[PDB]
Enzyme design. Structure first.
Site, short mmCIF file in Angstrom:
data_model
loop_
_atom_site.label_atom_id
_atom_site.label_comp_id
_atom_site.label_asym_id
_atom_site.label_seq_id
_atom_site.Cartn_x
_atom_site.Cartn_y
_atom_site.Cartn_z
N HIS A 2 0.80 -1.24 0.00
CA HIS A 2 0.00 0.00 0.00
C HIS A 2 0.84 1.30 0.00
CE1 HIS A 2 -4.10 -1.91 0.84
NE2 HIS A 2 -3.28 -2.89 1.14
N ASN A 40 -10.35 -2.61 3.00
CA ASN A 40 -10.12 -2.50 1.54
C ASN A 40 -11.47 -2.22 0.87
OD1 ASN A 40 -7.32 -2.93 1.15
ND2 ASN A 40 -7.56 -5.12 0.79
#
Ligand code: HEM
Ligand code: HEM
Ligand SMILES: Oc1ccc(O)cc1
Ligand SMILES: Oc1ccc(O)cc1
Ligand SMILES: Oc1ccc(O)cc1
Ligand SMILES: Oc1ccc(O)cc1
Ligand SMILES: [Cl-]
Ligand SMILES: [Cl-]
Ligand SMILES: [Cl-]
Ligand SMILES: [Cl-]
Ligand SMILES: [Cl-]
Ligand SMILES: [Cl-]
Ligand code: NA
Ligand code: NA
Lengths: 480, 480, 480, 480
Positions: free
Chosen positions: A52, A125
């Site tokens: 990420h 997510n």
């Protein structure tokens, strides 16, 4: 009107010329301003997040519409109208800082709630399930998806090898290769807790909970061809979009829903309700509205606030607890572990990471101690009534253990293919075609044996799904 | 056929499942394999380079065609046919690690020669000049060019504000906004030392030298439109191209030329020969061929070798020395300085960075000491004849200093515009149009005052250059 | 009355028990309090100072008695009665943190003045000269003195090998092996700037300056036997003494004097006035009183304030400048260099290291950015009048360079032995006997050749000095 | 006969003089040798161990006399005469690196066995029990013992406050304030595993085990007055002694014994056999001889080998497993955790920490990667038969869990005072007097309420013990 100064507070006489032997000679060592300025420049960068790495952040507010006190004692959810400040970071997953926001990937959706009983991080997510169900596998999965360690280019042959041999991935891949694998931007995007968590109320009763964020802006996705066209002209379109919306006063927002499930429902279901490769039926376990989050303020400095932001699923508050989900359990460790390396032992003092709630404890020192500590007493128990003490009103629950032994063993009822077939069949005909199209372009160059095993996994999910994929790849699967 | 092990060498029984309370319970702290595996995954990343973060490496060989012993005592250049191993990294400049290779930027061209008298690093770029002439300005220049510290997006208004107020940039910008600002890939690309250096022969006689690399594959560039079309489908095309050439045996190569200039030519010229905003005329100072470098071997591991590679302009060998160039003088410090932070105090022991020549000295310890040191004597002078001693046959020259005070002062004869005009006029009509097109697309949105000052700087270079840019931007420059 | 909390601000329910499978089972990974607390404990320690690791700090105030504006424009010295806050750290040199304060060593005397024009660090020792005159030798000198790299025990054979082959050490050793090599404590102790510095007044006129601190408590020393008796019972007696004085209101103080010397006095002296192995005669260059420093406040936290304190000789203020002293010149680099490693890139934001004067510049980011930065402009020049700008009223002087080449060459008139003889002869008979006693106990076990060379060095200083040492060591100096 | 070089392998011309403007001028920035040498000197130090900072190491050999295969499958114990290389570090506990070895403290006794199935660390102390029984308390205990965070001096009032309120400490203190609290040196000293561990044989049968090391040189201790006399003349006498023994060929050795206890004995006992505040009766559970360890080789470099050595109780080998001991359970985490910070992510590649057994796994990168990695496959499962795979012949046991909830709860039968009384009564009259004397000198200045509570804790252990202490302290305990 202000002076340029050194870090010592001395005003700078010349910020243009190095100190030299005459106007064109070599440079002297006695130039504190040059050496200080270069040395700090030389140290600007810190390690990017291990996953990420590419992302963007914003602040805003969460407001309760329906109190949740029947199901959880969480303080930030206790009353209608109660408002809590948030910081949020959105992200891609695999590629480094600087990589394009038009690639196929889950999108991170990490929310920090600054509550009166401590910071609560919900580290989500967009997509509601995951590839794997045990944290031991995470470095494997990530290694397979990341650019090849020799070439520095992502290789479908590598992640498909892993995924095909990890058939619990099948449900995830059925979402990820829909066009929702490339959200149009961070605002027009779903959010999900993914895991089952435990909610514990004022009577000590526990329920299982799942979280869902629904965008006010609606969901919008990019085809592979729409993604390419954006990639051509902007490799940072989602970062740009989020900032610009907020600057123009067009604040994005999401409504928060939950599903709730009694603990006893375990024994009747044909899957494990804490298996993060599974969803819960919205018919059987309806979405219940909790509140709304609105993002309305850009950070002042990207590095200081977004780059240095630290979230962890283990930042839980009273009334909210982990489930037994073995994927979750590993995350509880890994986030603060990585953050101590990425940011320093005292990363929790970095302003974006600080709680609004008071902090008092007997920890000390570590690299970059900036907080002006004082006092002789840094141990407990101690004889002093004014020093910080434990508080038995804030104890976690004591979950019942159904197992007898320390084991390394897969969960029962893994059920790797059924929900993947249910999802497939829930798609419209156009969505089914996009799925097959996207899967085909990804698989067409992969090694034959792995290609076949992928087809068989999808065939097990649904015969029409697998057959279509086989037809589109030119693979004859009649012998099986 | 091999066991998976822990870092302690214990074979791993189960690489699939965490250790838990029964098959579905929460996870135990006594799972050394899980914690070790996650903890190391959590620490994989190190800081990227502060500039030139995106890049790619290869190994090869340099071969002398014409021995240079008349002008330099450099050992690697002493004989016809002498072969020296090299490692080379190519790169972009401004954007982070995963950023596209289709962006406008100089390209890095860093060559490490493993010579018998030490490692020699020639840390070059494709383009032969630079934006600035003093290292004190480098963090400013970079800050202006990098993504905005709030939005995380590059902003032409920011770097044009800096560049217009730094008119020495005018020559550089005239190269960079030709289509050579986007090379087609790393093979079909020029290389340059940029700075003037000093070559010193065995008699102690000194000449100024410039370096040039000419690609066997020729120079080829991308228009903005060709760059976009690549970007749409591949954000690492130049990394891919370099690897693939080498894998398929199509080894790229560059011939090395020098120009040489007596020190006494300083007064003969209307610019400073050590100003890195200036070239030397190829008519007056002709290119002389030295040899050929061929790249023929990909690295085994991108992180260990390319990511951890460390170059510095200060890694000089006997016969080759710095000039008085003030930009260069700062670089001598900055590179090892940043590398000690980026890689560790002992970065020079990482394999790619190790010399072939023997290393012996009295330095010790530091983070990650892996070299099995021994001996009681870590100081000099000492009474022991067998311990390492200085060797007076390897002393650097003693350049003459013309100045008599420690000063901070711009060089005489800055001459900021003349060579920019000479370059402009050397362009074909088609190249002139691309330059104006590229400049216009970059300038059209910047603040009006800054836009005007840019036009004036280019006008001072050449009246036609400036007039064309003004017309193309709709700016009326008749009052001036 | 306060809660114990996690760093997230969650109150802690139980600070006694780990989370486990029943009352006596193994421990769970889901125990955020346990893991956070241990993980921060595991990271408490930073690297100790490479030298002067053992030390103690206090705050106080410096008050001007005689304004110095005739000789320096330094703002903190401009008026009678002007008061400036200080932080001071005292130390030993060679052994690690935790080592006894009864060992032979110079003592550090580092004074940080928080002035209106920036922080001014005067980084002194008790003794007024040094072992060596060039910074290139410092790691060698230190390596020889430190515990042997095999045994971890200091070995006189090692440092006497270095010192004897470095005969410029002879004056230093003649002070160090008097009983002033073991001060009784930090209060009853001399201070010295050691180097010559340059003072520059408002008209641009320069003088050489030396600094001296004279203790109000007087100077008192320990014989080897008095040191042993203290060592037996207290290995931190000087740290204890300093703290206790201040806690009891018995504040220690030092008067500051200077000597001033015209630059032109170089050419008529028989030594180099910028050779740090040399003092200036107090008859020829009398001590002039400047002011008094009183220490009156203990720090609140030893790690945060004393351990993390950072001094550098390069933290100079307008009116006070480096001399050409080559030992000093290396120190200008080394201190901020080591501190960036020891403390972090942003060590200057640690509270004890912060200036009182305003800090504004274009530096950014780095590990542990805690300062809440903001703004779009992090480069200069820029078009904004309100952003920080250079200020030409604060330029350093432009010292005249006598040399005309870049060279590596010893200073002229090293004169290694004369002042060592002058010092010897200035000792009382009782002081001479202590010196010979101290030297003899240190030299008796060293290798015979090195022993002889030491005797010869001290003989060159004064024949009686050397003869006495020879007799006391049983060495026959007749052949020489 | 060798050249001094830079780290680049360039021979050094002059290791005496900095590069300067003439023989007496200021220093140039272009002096790579000076800057490289100082910069590495500036970075020598790493963080000391958070506890056991002061210590010394040696290598040797362990030899099996009685094979243990009936009770453990451990490979290094499988056959008579089987020899295994060891590295051993001894240490004090509380004070920093250069602190005296004459202070009261447990002594560390850490043994690394380089076995054919991986490295096995037995991280012991001389004394056989500990102060506390849960790792959550360790930072508290340590903070109380360590120098006061304000003054930097240890304060008995602080650790006695903690210990008196933590009455499980009472057995430990009854050993530590005997004269065995100051061993004479590291050779004439006991060793202990402290914890109960689990031994598992090839049939999967488990026993509880305790380890004991008995010195061939016998046990010798120092009175406070003997310790003072040594402290006066040598603050590193134990480090000196160990080195000197080994240099002179007088190799110290210890015989290894175990006690074994069936798991079912839990109910037979009035204490918890896994409580580290408890020993096991030698009558009921006799010492069984296993083998002998002889130390016979000093390290070559103290920093590289001793300072950078890393031990962890979690470095276990097949056949040897943790017990449920909650103190132990925390240690499994804390050692590798601290080491990654103290030494780097790749600390396991430092030569002393490397296994003799093969290491093959899918971990990669991290700061200072020096191991020349290669290959495309860094994930598992994968389709390649030649890549490393799990091996089910090496699984740990599956200990039974008695508890059925996740709890935070003290063990049953803490029994805090009984064994302390048994130990007291086992002392000779001379030992009892030294205990009281030592306790009295430590307690006499602590706060009265805490003093009384200490007396009462020791009174609960044994009435005579407590009465004598009370008399000696002038405390009248008639009324209790
Ligand atoms: C080339 C010569 C020298 C070099 C290379 C050198 C280098 C150093 C270094 C690296 C430190 C540790 C700084 C830190 O981590 O904060 C230090 C500390 C210190 N040095 Fe030096 N030094 C030199 C000469 C001297 C001299 C001449 C004096 C006194 C005149 C001196 C006094 C001190 C003091 C007092 C400290 C401790 C400051 C504190 O309390 O933190 N040094 N030196
Ligand atoms: C919960 C209880 C304890 C905790 C948290 C703890 C923690 C630690 C830590 C973090 C270190 C530093 C290790 C390194 O830097 O590599 C250490 C060192 C050490 N501890 Fe403990 N410890 C505990 C109990 C004990 C016990 C019971 C013993 C002996 C039985 C012991 C003996 C040692 C030794 C000998 C060392 C130094 C090892 C070496 O020489 O490198 N500790 N401890
Ligand atoms: O995280 C992922 C991105 C792209 C994929 O094709 C698969 C996983
Ligand atoms: O490095 C640079 C890239 C793009 C620009 O427009 C200017 C400089
Ligand atoms: O700093 C020093 C300590 C002891 C010595 O014998 C010489 C120097
Ligand atoms: O570790 C210890 C040190 C000193 C004491 O007086 C007691 C324990
Ligand atoms: Cl705490
Ligand atoms: Cl060296
Ligand atoms: Cl650094
Ligand atoms: Cl700046
Ligand atoms: Cl870490
Ligand atoms: Cl692995
Ligand atoms: Na030739
Ligand atoms: Na005055």
């Amino acid at each position: 009107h202000k002076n340029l100064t050194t870090n010592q507070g001395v005003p700078v006489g010349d910020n243009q010329n190095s100190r030299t032997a005459g106007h064109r000679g070599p440079s002297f060592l006695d130039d504190y301003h040059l050496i200080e300025k270069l040395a700090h420049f030389d140290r600007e960068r810190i390690p990017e997040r291990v996953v990420h790495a590419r992302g963007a952040g914003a602040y805003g507010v969460f407001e309760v519409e329906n109190s949740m006190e029947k199901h959880t004692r969480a303080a930030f959810l206790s009353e209608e109208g109660k408002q809590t400040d948030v910081f949020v970071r959105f992200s891609t997953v695999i590629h480094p800082k600087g990589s394009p926001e038009t690639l196929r990937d889950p999108r991170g959706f990490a929310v920090k709630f600054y509550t009166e009983e401590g910071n609560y991080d919900l580290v989500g997510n967009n997509l509601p399930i995951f590839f794997i169900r045990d944290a031991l596998k995470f470095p494997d999965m990530v290694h397979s998806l990341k650019p090849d360690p020799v070439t520095n280019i992502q290789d479908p042959d590598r992640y498909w090898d892993f995924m095909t041999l990890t058939p619990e991935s099948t449900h995830m891949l059925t979402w990820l290769f829909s066009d929702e694998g490339i959200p149009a931007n961070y605002a027009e995007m779903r959010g999900s807790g993914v895991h089952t968590f435990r909610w514990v109320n004022k009577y000590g009763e526990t329920k299982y909970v799942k979280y869902h964020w629904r965008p006010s802006e609606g969901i919008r996705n990019l085809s592979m061809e729409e993604a390419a066209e954006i990639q051509a002209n902007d490799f940072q379109h989602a970062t740009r979009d989020l900032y610009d919306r907020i600057e123009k006063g067009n604040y994005p927002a999401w409504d928060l829903y939950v599903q709730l499930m009694p603990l006893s429902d375990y024994d009747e279901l044909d899957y494990d309700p804490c298996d993060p490769t599974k969803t819960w039926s919205e018919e059987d376990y309806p979405l219940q509205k909790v509140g709304r989050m609105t993002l309305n303020r850009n950070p002042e400095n990207f590095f200081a606030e977004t780059e240095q932001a630290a979230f962890t699923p283990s930042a839980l508050v009273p009334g909210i607890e982990a489930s037994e989900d073995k994927l979750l359990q590993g995350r509880l460790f890994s986030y603060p572990d990585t953050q101590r390396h990425r940011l320093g032992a005292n990363y929790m003092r970095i302003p974006v990471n600080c709680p609004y709630a008071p902090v008092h404890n007997n920890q000390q020192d570590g690299f970059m101690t900036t907080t002006r500590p004082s006092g002789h007493i840094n141990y407990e128990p101690n004889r002093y009534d004014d020093q910080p003490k434990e508080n038995p009103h804030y104890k976690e629950s004591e979950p019942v253990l159904h197992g007898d032994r320390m084991v390394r063993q897969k969960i029962e009822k893994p059920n790797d293919f059924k929900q993947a077939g249910e999802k497939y069949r829930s798609y419209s005909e156009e969505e089914k075609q996009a799925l097959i199209k996207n899967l085909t372009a990804d698989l067409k160059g992969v090694n034959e044996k792995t290609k076949l095993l992928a087809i068989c996994n999808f065939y097990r999910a649904d015969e029409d799904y697998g057959q279509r994929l086989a037809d589109s790849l030119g693979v004859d699967i009649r012998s099986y």
